[PDB]
Design an enzyme around this catalytic site. Structure first.
Site: not given
Ligand SMILES: NC(=O)C1=CN([C@@H]2O[C@H](COP(=O)(O)OP(=O)(O)OC[C@H]3O[C@@H](n4cnc5c(N)ncnc54)[C@H](OP(=O)(O)O)[C@@H]3O)[C@@H](O)[C@H]2O)C=CC1
Length: 184
Positions: A20, A28
């Protein structure tokens, strides 16, 4: 239903060097876990569809993703990787499987959970699609990007059950949860 879930930076980034682009966001992750796991029908489970690289990016101790049926896409693998429930050779095949009586009576929601190549193919899916997008409200250096969200066909829903829409923030990084729908 058929659903896609993704987190995207302001520059539409979704990955950098196989990881990421941003540091880990606790809420999240929690949101992803709850949305993909929670069935709307008692006695049924959700199914997650992911690419091979995304499967092997999950630490082995956490595979398969708990509480969900895990299906991996690969053109090359011959049997499911250890721990996976199903292996499909195409997205068409995976979706066809979910329509068989023995999956239909078992599965509630189908969730596409990445990676980039799977999102690309899923974004070409005709019919009813919901996109659960976590907007990370910052730019991050990225080498792979989420496809365009065409507002001619996707409508941003102003509200959705179980989704907090307010802007959130962790160690200075703001983000918010959005839901889009198309019916074409
Ligand atoms: N921001 C986010 O929410 C997320 C971002 N990502 C990011 O995505 C990136 C990785 O994406 P990517 O490299 O595309 O990895 P994927 O997870 O999509 O894996 C790619 C592999 O999956 C198989 N595959 C994918 N689509 C199909 C298909 N339709 N039919 C058959 N097999 C298929 C192939 O395996 P084979 O070679 O065996 O044929 C292919 O090489 C990383 O940067 C990662 O961080 C990932 C998940 C969530």
């Amino acid at each position: 239903s058929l659903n896609c879930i993704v987190a995207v930076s302001q520059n539409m980034g979704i990955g950098k060097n196989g990881d990421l682009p941003w540091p880990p966001l606790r809420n999240e992750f929690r949101y992803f876990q709850r949305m993909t796991t929670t069935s709307s029908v008692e006695g049924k489970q959700n199914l997650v569809i992911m690419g091979k690289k995304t499967w092997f990016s999950i630490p082995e101790k956490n595979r398969p993703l708990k509480g969900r049926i895990n299906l991996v896409l690969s053109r090359e693998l011959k049997e499911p990787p250890q721990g996976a429930h199903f292996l499909s050779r195409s997205l068409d095949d995976a979706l066809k499987l979910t329509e068989q009586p023995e999956l239909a009576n078992k599965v509630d929601m189908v969730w596409i959970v990445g990676g980039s190549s799977v999102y690309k193919e899923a974004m070409n899916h005709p019919g009813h699609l919901k996109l659960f997008v976590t907007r990370i409200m910052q730019d991050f250096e990225s080498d792979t990007f989420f496809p365009e969200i065409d507002l001619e066909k996707y409508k941003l829903l102003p509200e959705y059950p179980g989704v907090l829409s307010d802007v959130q923030e962790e160690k200075g990084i703001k983000y918010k949860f959005e839901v889009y729908e198309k019916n074409d």
